[PDB]
Design a protein around this motif. Structure first.
Motif, short mmCIF file in Angstrom:
data_model
loop_
_atom_site.label_atom_id
_atom_site.label_comp_id
_atom_site.label_asym_id
_atom_site.label_seq_id
_atom_site.Cartn_x
_atom_site.Cartn_y
_atom_site.Cartn_z
N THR A 153 47.56 11.84 16.03
CA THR A 153 46.46 12.45 15.29
C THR A 153 45.16 12.27 16.06
O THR A 153 45.08 11.48 17.00
CB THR A 153 46.28 11.80 13.90
OG1 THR A 153 45.70 10.50 14.07
CG2 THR A 153 47.59 11.72 13.16
N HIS B 211 51.64 21.35 6.54
CA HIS B 211 50.21 21.55 6.81
C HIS B 211 49.67 22.75 6.04
O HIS B 211 50.10 23.02 4.91
CB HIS B 211 49.95 21.74 8.31
CG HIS B 211 50.85 22.74 8.96
ND1 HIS B 211 50.77 24.09 8.69
CD2 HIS B 211 51.85 22.60 9.86
CE1 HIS B 211 51.67 24.74 9.40
NE2 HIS B 211 52.34 23.85 10.12
N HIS C 117 57.85 12.14 4.50
CA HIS C 117 57.14 11.06 5.18
C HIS C 117 57.86 9.75 4.92
O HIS C 117 57.96 9.30 3.79
CB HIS C 117 55.70 10.93 4.66
CG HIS C 117 54.78 12.01 5.13
ND1 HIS C 117 53.65 11.75 5.87
CD2 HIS C 117 54.80 13.35 4.94
CE1 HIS C 117 53.02 12.88 6.13
NE2 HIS C 117 53.69 13.87 5.57
N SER D 145 58.25 5.92 4.72
CA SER D 145 57.38 4.76 4.66
C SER D 145 58.15 3.47 4.88
O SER D 145 57.57 2.41 5.14
CB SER D 145 56.62 4.72 3.33
OG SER D 145 57.52 4.59 2.24
N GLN E 252 48.57 10.57 -4.98
CA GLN E 252 48.17 9.78 -3.83
C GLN E 252 49.41 9.08 -3.34
O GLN E 252 50.20 8.58 -4.12
CB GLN E 252 47.14 8.72 -4.23
CG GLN E 252 45.86 9.27 -4.85
CD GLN E 252 44.66 8.38 -4.57
OE1 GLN E 252 44.64 7.65 -3.58
NE2 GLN E 252 43.66 8.45 -5.44
N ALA F 54 51.48 5.70 2.57
CA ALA F 54 50.87 5.98 3.87
C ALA F 54 49.93 4.83 4.19
O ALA F 54 49.39 4.21 3.28
CB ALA F 54 50.11 7.30 3.83
N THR G 20 46.85 4.60 5.51
CA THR G 20 45.65 4.92 4.77
C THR G 20 46.12 5.67 3.54
O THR G 20 46.88 6.63 3.66
CB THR G 20 44.71 5.83 5.58
OG1 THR G 20 44.19 5.11 6.70
CG2 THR G 20 43.56 6.32 4.71
N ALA G 21 45.70 5.23 2.35
CA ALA G 21 45.99 5.97 1.13
C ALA G 21 45.47 7.38 1.33
O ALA G 21 44.36 7.58 1.80
CB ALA G 21 45.31 5.33 -0.07
N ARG G 22 46.29 8.37 1.00
CA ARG G 22 45.89 9.75 1.20
C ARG G 22 46.31 10.61 0.02
O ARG G 22 47.31 10.34 -0.64
CB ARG G 22 46.49 10.31 2.48
CG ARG G 22 48.01 10.43 2.46
CD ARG G 22 48.50 11.15 3.70
NE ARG G 22 49.26 12.35 3.37
CZ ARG G 22 49.63 13.26 4.27
NH1 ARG G 22 49.31 13.11 5.54
NH2 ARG G 22 50.32 14.33 3.88
N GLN G 23 45.52 11.64 -0.23
CA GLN G 23 45.86 12.60 -1.26
C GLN G 23 47.03 13.43 -0.79
O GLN G 23 47.16 13.76 0.39
CB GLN G 23 44.67 13.50 -1.57
CG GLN G 23 43.43 12.72 -1.97
CD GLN G 23 43.73 11.61 -2.96
OE1 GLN G 23 43.64 10.43 -2.62
NE2 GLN G 23 44.09 11.99 -4.18
N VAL G 24 47.92 13.74 -1.72
CA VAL G 24 49.07 14.58 -1.44
C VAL G 24 49.13 15.64 -2.52
O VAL G 24 49.01 15.32 -3.70
CB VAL G 24 50.38 13.75 -1.45
CG1 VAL G 24 51.60 14.67 -1.36
CG2 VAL G 24 50.37 12.73 -0.31
#
Lengths: 95, 95
Positions: free
Chosen positions: A20, A81, A87, A89, B36, B40, B42-46
């Motif tokens: 990224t 995207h 994903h 984890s 969320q 991940a 970093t906590a991220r919006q999904v």
């Protein structure tokens, strides 16, 4: 809101590691599932492949796993995207 | 092999009930997830939408649920018939 997939699946292939903009490594891969859903009223065979990815330490982990390896995966679904990607984890060798 | 998805998601729309050749009812629907992933680094919006279906008693259950309703779903992934579909094996109203 819960969004959690548990999947035992074979690693079919993986792409070269990419990064990224922040420098977080990502390894995209393809997993193949073959099993039985006892959750269906009649037990039925289920087979599919699913795009997955590992980020951060999980990218490093996937980058060292041989294609053909069966993996016990946990993680969550997200948009690529539209198409979805698994994903990962958490990961263990199944055997 | 485990194949289990847990998802809390909003019912967006559902199709008219149809039947397999054996007479098993199927209701296809679209679910929308928004949350969320703490999984991940970093906590991220999904946010994504996913095609789902209920068969048998689960078809009957889905057939009576209003679009807009938030559902706590469990089930498994499978091939539509390639694209994937969330087969719901268990359902509760989230609220």
């Amino acid at each position: 809101a819960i969004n959690r997939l548990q999947l035992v699946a074979t690693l079919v292939e993986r792409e070269v590691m990419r990064y990224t903009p922040a420098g977080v490594p990502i390894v995209n891969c393809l997993l193949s599932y073959s099993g039985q859903a006892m959750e269906a009223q009649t037990a039925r065979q289920v087979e599919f492949s699913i795009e997955a990815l590992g980020a951060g330490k999980m990218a490093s982990v996937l980058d060292r796993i041989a294609p053909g390896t069966v993996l016990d995966c946990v993680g969550f679904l997200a948009r690529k995207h539209k198409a979805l990607v698994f994903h990962i984890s958490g990961l263990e060798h199944h055997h």
